[PDB]
């Protein structure tokens, strides 16, 4: 209940050190990574010392958040690997 991980995420997803790198999709319930390159290389190690994007997704799962790598409908999806939208709950 109220872990230090979700408590530190409320400041990173904001826009202080990553001002113009990570923003909300529309009003929450999802995060968007327009430039995962400049982000990870200059943001992932600026909070979790030397972790990788894989470790970041691991914490999101054990706390409640989740990734998004499925192809249900997608009229023209499945054609990009550098810009996705984190989901708060894909399945249960």
Swiss-Prot record:
Residue ranges of DNA binding = 1-89
Record's comment on post-translational modification:
Exhibits temperature-dependent phosphorylation.
Disulfide linkages recorded for this protein, renumbered to the chain, are none
What top-level branch of life does the organism fall under?
Eukaryota
Where does the UniProt annotation locate this protein? Nucleus
Q: Its function?
A: DNA-binding transcription factor that specifically binds heat shock promoter elements (HSE) and activates transcription.
Q: Which family does it belong to?
A: Belongs to the HSF family.
Assembly state and interactors? Homotrimer. Homotrimerization increases the affinity of HSF1 to DNA.
Tell me what this protein is called: Heat shock transcription factor
User: What organism is this sequence from?
Assistant: Kluyveromyces lactis (strain ATCC 8585 / CBS 2359 / DSM 70799 / NBRC 1267 / NRRL Y-1140 / WM37) (Yeast)
The gene it comes from is HSF
């Amino acid at each position: 209940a109220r872990p230090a991980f979700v408590n530190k995420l409320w400041s990173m997803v904001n826009d202080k050190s990553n001002e113009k790198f990570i923003h909300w999709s529309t009003s929450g319930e999802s995060i968007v990574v327009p430039n995962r390159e400049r982000f990870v290389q200059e943001v992932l190690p600026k909070y979790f010392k030397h972790s990788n994007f894989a470790s970041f997704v691991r914490q999101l799962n054990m706390y409640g958040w989740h990734k998004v790598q499925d192809v249900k409908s997608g009229s023209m999806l499945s054609n990009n690997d550098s810009r996705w939208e984190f989901e708060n709950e894909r399945h249960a």
